[PDB]
Short mmCIF file of C-alpha atoms and ligand atoms in Angstrom, two decimals:
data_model
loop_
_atom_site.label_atom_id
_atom_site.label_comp_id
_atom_site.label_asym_id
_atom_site.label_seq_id
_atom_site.Cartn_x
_atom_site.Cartn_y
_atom_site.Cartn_z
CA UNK A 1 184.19 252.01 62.53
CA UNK A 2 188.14 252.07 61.95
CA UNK A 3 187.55 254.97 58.95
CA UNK A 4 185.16 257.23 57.84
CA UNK A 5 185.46 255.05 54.54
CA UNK A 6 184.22 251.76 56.65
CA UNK A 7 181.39 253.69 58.98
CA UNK A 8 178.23 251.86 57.79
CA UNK A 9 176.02 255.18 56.56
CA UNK A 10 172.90 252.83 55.28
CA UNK A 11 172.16 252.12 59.39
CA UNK A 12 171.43 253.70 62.00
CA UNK A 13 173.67 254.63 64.48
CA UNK A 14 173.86 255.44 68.46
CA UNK A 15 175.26 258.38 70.18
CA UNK A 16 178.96 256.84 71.06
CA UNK A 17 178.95 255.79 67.49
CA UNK A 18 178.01 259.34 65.66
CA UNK A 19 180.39 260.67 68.53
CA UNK A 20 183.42 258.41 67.38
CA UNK A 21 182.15 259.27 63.83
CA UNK A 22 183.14 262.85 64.65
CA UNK A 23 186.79 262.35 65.93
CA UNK A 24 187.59 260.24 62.76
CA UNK A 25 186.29 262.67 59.95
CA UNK A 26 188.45 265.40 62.08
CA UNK A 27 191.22 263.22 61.73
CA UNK A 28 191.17 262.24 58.20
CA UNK A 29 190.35 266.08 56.98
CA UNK A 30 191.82 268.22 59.49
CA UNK A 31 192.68 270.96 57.33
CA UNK A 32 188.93 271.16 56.41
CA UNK A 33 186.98 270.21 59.56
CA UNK A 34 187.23 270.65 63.05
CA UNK A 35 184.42 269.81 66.13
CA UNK A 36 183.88 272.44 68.39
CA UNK A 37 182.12 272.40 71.56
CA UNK A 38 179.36 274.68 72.31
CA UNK A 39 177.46 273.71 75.33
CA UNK A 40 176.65 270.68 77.77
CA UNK A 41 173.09 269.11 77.57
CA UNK A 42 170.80 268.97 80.73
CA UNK A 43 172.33 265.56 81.56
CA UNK A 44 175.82 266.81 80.70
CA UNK A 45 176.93 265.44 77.47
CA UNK A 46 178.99 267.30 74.82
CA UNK A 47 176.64 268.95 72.27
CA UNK A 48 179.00 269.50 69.16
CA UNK A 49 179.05 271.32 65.79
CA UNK A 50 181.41 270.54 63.23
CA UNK A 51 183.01 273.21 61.30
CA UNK A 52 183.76 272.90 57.97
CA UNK A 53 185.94 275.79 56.54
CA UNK A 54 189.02 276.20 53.99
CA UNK A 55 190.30 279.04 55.82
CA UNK A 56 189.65 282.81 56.78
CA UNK A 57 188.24 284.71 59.56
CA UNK A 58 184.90 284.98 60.35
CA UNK A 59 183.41 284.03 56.63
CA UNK A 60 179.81 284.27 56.56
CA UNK A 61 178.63 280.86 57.61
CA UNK A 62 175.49 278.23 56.94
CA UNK A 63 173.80 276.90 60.52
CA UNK A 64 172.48 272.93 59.63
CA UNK A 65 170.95 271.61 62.42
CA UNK A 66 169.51 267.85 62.81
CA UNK A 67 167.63 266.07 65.51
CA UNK A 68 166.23 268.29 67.67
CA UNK A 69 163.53 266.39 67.73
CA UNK A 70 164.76 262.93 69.16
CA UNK A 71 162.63 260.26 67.55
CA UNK A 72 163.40 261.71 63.78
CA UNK A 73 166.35 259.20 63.28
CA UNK A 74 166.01 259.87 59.59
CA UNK A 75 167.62 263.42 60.59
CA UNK A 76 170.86 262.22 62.68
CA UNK A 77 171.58 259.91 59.76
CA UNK A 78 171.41 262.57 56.98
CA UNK A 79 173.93 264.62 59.39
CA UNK A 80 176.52 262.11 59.32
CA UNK A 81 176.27 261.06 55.85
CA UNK A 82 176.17 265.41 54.62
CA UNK A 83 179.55 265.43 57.17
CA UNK A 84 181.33 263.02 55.12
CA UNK A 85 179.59 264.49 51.77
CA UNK A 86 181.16 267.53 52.53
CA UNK A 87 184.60 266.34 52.98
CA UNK A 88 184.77 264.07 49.63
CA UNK A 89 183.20 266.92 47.30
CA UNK A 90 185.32 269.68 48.56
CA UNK A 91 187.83 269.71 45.51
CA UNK A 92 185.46 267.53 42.99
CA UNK A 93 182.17 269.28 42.50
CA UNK A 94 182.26 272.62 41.21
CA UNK A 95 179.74 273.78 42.86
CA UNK A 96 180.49 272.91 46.65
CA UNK A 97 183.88 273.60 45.98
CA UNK A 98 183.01 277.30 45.17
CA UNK A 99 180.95 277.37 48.43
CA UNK A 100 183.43 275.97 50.98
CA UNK A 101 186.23 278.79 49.49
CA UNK A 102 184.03 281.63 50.45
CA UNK A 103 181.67 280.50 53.41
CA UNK A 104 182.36 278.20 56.35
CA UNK A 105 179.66 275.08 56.97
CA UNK A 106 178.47 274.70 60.63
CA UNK A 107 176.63 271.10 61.74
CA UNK A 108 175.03 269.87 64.49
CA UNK A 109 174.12 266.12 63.81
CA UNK A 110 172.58 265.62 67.29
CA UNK A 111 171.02 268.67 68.33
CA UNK A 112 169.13 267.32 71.34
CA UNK A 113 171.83 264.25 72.41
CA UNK A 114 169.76 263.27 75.39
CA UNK A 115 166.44 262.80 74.09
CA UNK A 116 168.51 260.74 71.57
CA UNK A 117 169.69 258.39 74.18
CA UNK A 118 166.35 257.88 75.66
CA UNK A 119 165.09 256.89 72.35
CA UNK A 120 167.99 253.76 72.08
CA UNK A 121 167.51 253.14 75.74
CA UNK A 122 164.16 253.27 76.78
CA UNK A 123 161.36 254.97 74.10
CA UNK A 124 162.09 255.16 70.60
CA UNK A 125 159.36 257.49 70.14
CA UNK A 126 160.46 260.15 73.11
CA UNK A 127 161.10 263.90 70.73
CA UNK A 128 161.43 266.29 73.69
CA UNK A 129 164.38 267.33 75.78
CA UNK A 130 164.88 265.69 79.30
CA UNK A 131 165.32 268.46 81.65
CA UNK A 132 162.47 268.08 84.66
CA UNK A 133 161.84 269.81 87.36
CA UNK A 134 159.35 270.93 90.11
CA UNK A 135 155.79 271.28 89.77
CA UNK A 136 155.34 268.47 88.01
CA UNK A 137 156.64 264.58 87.32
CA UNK A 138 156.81 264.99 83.49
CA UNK A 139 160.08 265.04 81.86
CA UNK A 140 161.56 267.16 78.88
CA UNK A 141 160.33 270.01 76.12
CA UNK A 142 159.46 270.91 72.54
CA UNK A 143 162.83 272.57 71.59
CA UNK A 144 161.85 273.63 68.77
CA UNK A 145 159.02 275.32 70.55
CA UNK A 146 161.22 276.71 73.26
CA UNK A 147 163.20 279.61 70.91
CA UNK A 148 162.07 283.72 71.33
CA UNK A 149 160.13 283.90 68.11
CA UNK A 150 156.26 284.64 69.52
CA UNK A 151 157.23 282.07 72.50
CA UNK A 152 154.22 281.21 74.47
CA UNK A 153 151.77 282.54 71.65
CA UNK A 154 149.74 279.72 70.19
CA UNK A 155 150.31 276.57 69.00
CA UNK A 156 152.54 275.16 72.16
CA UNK A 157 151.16 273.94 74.72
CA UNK A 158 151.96 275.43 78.56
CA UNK A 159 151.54 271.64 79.88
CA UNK A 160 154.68 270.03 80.73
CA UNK A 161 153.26 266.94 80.24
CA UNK A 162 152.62 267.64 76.77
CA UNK A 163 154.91 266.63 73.55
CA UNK A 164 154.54 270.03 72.66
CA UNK A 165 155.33 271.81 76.23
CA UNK A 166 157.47 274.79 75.18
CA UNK A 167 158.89 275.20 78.47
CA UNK A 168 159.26 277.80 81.15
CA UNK A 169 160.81 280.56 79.11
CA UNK A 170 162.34 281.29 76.09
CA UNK A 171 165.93 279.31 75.70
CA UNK A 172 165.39 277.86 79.09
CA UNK A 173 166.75 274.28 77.29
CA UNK A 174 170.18 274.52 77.16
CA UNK A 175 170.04 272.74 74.32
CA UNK A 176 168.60 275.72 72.14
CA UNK A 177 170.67 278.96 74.48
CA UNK A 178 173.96 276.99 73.29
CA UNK A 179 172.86 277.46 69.52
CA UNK A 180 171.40 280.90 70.58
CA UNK A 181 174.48 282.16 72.01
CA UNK A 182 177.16 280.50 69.59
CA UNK A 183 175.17 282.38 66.46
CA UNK A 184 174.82 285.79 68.37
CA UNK A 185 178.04 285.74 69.00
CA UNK A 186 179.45 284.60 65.70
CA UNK A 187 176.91 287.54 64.08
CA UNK A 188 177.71 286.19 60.67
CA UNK A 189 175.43 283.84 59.50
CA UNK A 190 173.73 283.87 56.30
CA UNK A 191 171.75 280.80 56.15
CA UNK A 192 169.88 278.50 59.10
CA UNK A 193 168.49 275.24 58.23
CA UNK A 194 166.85 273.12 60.47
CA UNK A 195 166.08 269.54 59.68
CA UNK A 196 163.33 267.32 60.69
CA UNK A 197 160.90 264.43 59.88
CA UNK A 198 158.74 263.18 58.40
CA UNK A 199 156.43 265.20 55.99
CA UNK A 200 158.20 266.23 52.92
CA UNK A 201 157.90 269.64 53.20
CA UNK A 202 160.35 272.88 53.25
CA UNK A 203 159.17 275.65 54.85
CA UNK A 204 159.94 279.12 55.73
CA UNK A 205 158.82 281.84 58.52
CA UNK A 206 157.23 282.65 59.87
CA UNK A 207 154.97 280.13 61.96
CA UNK A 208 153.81 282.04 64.98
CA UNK A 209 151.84 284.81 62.88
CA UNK A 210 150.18 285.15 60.09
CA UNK A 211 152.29 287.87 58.76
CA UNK A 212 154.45 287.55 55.67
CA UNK A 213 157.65 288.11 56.07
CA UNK A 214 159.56 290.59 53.57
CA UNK A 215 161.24 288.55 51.80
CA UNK A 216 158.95 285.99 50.91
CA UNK A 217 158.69 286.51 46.90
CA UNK A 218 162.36 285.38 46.85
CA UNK A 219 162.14 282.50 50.01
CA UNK A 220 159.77 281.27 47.52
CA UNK A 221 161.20 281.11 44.68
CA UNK A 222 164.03 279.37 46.76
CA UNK A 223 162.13 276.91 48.26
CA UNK A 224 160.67 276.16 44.58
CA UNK A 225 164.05 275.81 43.07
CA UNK A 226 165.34 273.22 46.08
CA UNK A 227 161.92 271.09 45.87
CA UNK A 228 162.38 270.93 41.79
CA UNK A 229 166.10 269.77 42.82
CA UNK A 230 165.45 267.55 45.23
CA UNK A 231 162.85 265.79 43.36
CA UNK A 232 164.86 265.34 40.46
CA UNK A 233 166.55 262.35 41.61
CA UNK A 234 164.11 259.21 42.87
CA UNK A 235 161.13 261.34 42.29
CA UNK A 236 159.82 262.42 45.87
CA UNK A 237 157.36 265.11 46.11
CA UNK A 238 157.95 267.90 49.08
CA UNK A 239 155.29 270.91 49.29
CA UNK A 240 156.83 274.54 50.16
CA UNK A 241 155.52 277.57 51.83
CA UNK A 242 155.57 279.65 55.08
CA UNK A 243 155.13 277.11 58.20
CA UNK A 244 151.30 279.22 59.29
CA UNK A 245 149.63 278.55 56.18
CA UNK A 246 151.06 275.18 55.20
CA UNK A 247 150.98 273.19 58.49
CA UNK A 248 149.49 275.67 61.40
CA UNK A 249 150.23 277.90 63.50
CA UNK A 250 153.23 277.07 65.77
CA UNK A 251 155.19 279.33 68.57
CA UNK A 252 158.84 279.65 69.45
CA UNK A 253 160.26 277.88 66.40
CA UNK A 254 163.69 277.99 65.40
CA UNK A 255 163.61 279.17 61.92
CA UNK A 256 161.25 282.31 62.92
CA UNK A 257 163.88 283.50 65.62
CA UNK A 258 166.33 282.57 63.21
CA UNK A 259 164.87 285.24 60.48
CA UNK A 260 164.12 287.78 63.04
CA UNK A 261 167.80 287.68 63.85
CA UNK A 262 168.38 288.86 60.12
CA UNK A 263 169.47 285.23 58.36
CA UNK A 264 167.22 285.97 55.56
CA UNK A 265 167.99 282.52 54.59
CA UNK A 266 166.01 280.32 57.18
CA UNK A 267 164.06 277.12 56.72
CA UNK A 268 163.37 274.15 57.53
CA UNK A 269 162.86 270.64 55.90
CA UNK A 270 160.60 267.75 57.02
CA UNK A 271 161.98 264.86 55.16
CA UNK A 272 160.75 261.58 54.24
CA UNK A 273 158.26 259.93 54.08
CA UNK A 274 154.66 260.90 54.44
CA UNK A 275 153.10 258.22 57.00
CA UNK A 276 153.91 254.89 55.53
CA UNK A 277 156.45 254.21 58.03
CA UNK A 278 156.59 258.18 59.53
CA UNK A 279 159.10 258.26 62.08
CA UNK A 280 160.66 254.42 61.83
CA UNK A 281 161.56 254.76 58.11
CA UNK A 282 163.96 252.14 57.22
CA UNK A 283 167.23 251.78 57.27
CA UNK A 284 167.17 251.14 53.14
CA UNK A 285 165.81 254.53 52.50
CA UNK A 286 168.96 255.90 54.57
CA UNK A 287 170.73 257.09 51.53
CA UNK A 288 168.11 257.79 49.06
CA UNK A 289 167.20 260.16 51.42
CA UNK A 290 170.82 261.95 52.21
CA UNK A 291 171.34 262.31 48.69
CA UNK A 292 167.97 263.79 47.65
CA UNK A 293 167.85 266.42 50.69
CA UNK A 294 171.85 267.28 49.92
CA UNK A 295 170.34 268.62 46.44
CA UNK A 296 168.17 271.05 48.15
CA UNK A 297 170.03 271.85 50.78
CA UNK A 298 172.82 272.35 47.89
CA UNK A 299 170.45 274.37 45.88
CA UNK A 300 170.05 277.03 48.82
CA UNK A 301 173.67 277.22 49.49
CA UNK A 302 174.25 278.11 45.97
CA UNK A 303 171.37 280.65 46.64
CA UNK A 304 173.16 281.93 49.33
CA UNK A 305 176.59 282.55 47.96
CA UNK A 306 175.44 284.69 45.37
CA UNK A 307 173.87 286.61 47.09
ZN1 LIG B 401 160.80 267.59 64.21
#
């Protein structure tokens, strides 16, 4: 509350909270982090990134983005405990350090703020956006069906009543044209992960078609290297492969417009659990969980850097 050192990361949190969270990790660290703006959401509330840089101009970058998907609380809570992560190993692991002096770190804790709302305020449960409109009385879409990667294609549905309605066009949220438009413009990102729950998995493109992508021998072997890392502190098994063949087939997802932008680096985590408690995990496996998924997401950093 009064510090970053005193914010309560094994709970979960509401939007003015994360919000204030924000302001005080810019003030303690301001030579390292700074909160930009990059859009509005549908019912006009800030959507912010945090920037986390040691200097330059234009450095090649990392995109994380968290909750997209409203109801995966497990997501907005590994955002604001990776924020303050960031800011205490810059300077004390070797590693990170090496990262942060070469490439700049850009986070979006609350991707989709006013789905995340809804889910203190009335339905814990909502995941889509809450834009509405004309032909029909149901509220919201699939963001992370709503990006131009094979939008429309199958596996969305064209029902806005549905959880998985992708919407009426590609970036018509302006939740996902504000992330569209910030990473066009910046043109130098290297890396785009996008976090979710629950399922354990990390996955890469594409999901809309069955073709491989290029680079998969090396995504791969990645993906192989972050699971191993991950696992190797409390144990917890994630699978890894291309989203089509280890799920099914899925349209207008973020890491497949992500790729075919060129950030050869792009996938996506599903983190814990695997059904016990699915999208309510507790509050106790708050940190277990930030700590594991910081290995992997550490582990393709380090990927990235090099090369
Ligand atoms: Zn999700």
């Amino acid at each position: 509350a009064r510090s970053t050192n005193t914010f309560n990361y094994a709970t979960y949190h509401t939007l003015d909270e994360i919000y204030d969270f924000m302001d005080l990790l810019v003030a303690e660290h301001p030579q390292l982090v700074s909160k930009l703006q990059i859009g509005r959401s549908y019912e006009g509330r800030p959507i912010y990134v945090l920037k986390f840089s040691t200097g330059g101009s234009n450095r090649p970058a990392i995109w994380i983005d968290l909750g997209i998907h409203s109801r995966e609380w497990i997501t907005q809570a590994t955002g604001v405990w990776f924020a303050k992560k960031f800011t205490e190993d810059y300077g004390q692991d070797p590693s990170f350090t090496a990262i942060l002096d070469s490439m700049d770190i850009f986070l979006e804790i609350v991707t989709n703020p006013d789905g995340f709302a809804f889910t203190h305020s009335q339905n814990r449960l909502w995941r889509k956006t809450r834009s509405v409109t004309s032909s029909s009385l149901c509220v919201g879409v699939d963001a992370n069906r709503n990006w131009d990667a094979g939008f429309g294609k199958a596996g969305a549905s064209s029902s806005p009543c549905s959880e998985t309605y992708h919407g009426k066009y590609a970036n018509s949220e302006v939740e996902v044209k504000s992330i569209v438009d910030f990473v066009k413009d910046h043109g130098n990102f290297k890396a785009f992960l996008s976090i979710h729950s629950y399922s354990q998995l990390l996955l890469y493109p594409y999901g809309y078609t069955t073709q491989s992508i290029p680079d998969k021998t090396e995504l791969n072997q990645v993906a192989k290297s972050a699971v191993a890392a991950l696992k190797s502190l409390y144990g917890t098994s994630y699978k890894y492969g291309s989203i089509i063949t280890t799920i099914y087939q899925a349209s207008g997802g973020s890491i497949d417009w992500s790729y075919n932008q060129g950030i050869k680096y792009s996938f996506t985590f599903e983190l814990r659990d695997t059904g016990r408690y699915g999208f309510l995990l507790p509050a106790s496996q708050i940190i277990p969980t930030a700590q594991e998924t910081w290995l992997g997401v550490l582990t393709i950093m380090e990927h990235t850097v090099n090369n």
